[PDB]
Every structure is written in C-alpha cells, then in structure tokens.
C-alpha cells in the first residue's frame, strides 16, 4: 500500500502511538484513539498531541475518561471520517477516492488558515512598529 494513504489504516494509526500514556483502565487508549481517527504527533512541549488524519484537528490535554469519538464530534463536528461507518477494505473505490479528495481539501484549508494567521500576526507587528514611529 502507498505511504500516502496509510493514515486511512487503523493499524497504522495505532502504530503512531509511541509512549502514549493512558493504557488499559482508561477510555482513551491508543486503540480507541486510532478508532476515532486520531494520530499521535507529540511535540516536546505537548507529547500529548493527537491529530485526526482526515480533518487534521489537533487535540491535547487528553483526560483518561475522555471518549475519543466524543471529543472528536464535539471539536470537529463536520469531519467526514465520523460519518464513515465502514471498515476500510470494505470501502468502494469511488467512496474512497471521494473521501481522499475531501481529506486533501481539509489539508489545504488547514494550511491556508495557518498562513492567514501568520500573515495577520506579521501585519499587526508592522502596523504597531509604524504607529510607534509616529511619536
């Protein structure tokens, strides 16, 4: 299988979970995280960081009683992955192609929003500097 669509595979998502806290006993296990579409992408700041592979919503501050699916609908309710009630290899090619398409769109919107924020913060610094010059 191509490296690009591995995130669609639950077993692969589980694998990303390296030194994940919260194991047996907790509702937010790696297996339940992965089931919910989450991937482990730990920083150094927050080695607690989980990201949906489909909508790219990033969540941290995970609580052991948190239901991953429930944390997921709440924070990213429009995510199409949540509506997929089918296992991967039972997916139709048309259905899959159409999902991978929306995921690609989801990725751009996230990158686009990030760029917008960086630009706006840069703009605010410039303005401030110029305001200060007038004085």
């Amino acid at each position: 299988l191509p490296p690009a669509w591995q995130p669609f595979l639950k077993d692969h998502r589980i694998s990303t979970f390296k030194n994940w806290p919260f194991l047996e006993g907790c509702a937010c296990t790696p297996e339940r995280m992965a089931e919910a579409g989450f991937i482990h992408c730990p920083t150094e700041n927050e080695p607690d960081l989980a990201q949906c592979f489909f909508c790219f919503k990033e969540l941290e501050g995970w609580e052991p009683d948190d239901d991953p699916i429930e944390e997921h609908k709440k924070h990213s309710s429009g995510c199409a992955f949540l509506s997929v009630k089918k296992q991967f290899e039972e997916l139709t090619l048309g259905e899959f192609l159409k999902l991978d398409r929306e995921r690609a769109k989801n990725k751009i919107a996230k990158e686009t929003n990030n760029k917008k924020k960086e630009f706006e913060e840069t703009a605010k610094k410039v303005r401030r500097a110029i305001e200060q010059l007038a004085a």
């Binding site: 927050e46 989980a50 969540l59 501050g61 609580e63």
Partner: peptide
C-alpha cells in the same frame, strides 16, 4: 480533551 482540548483544542490546541
């Protein structure tokens, strides 16, 4: 959990 919480939104970064």
């Amino acid at each position: 959990a919480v939104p970064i």
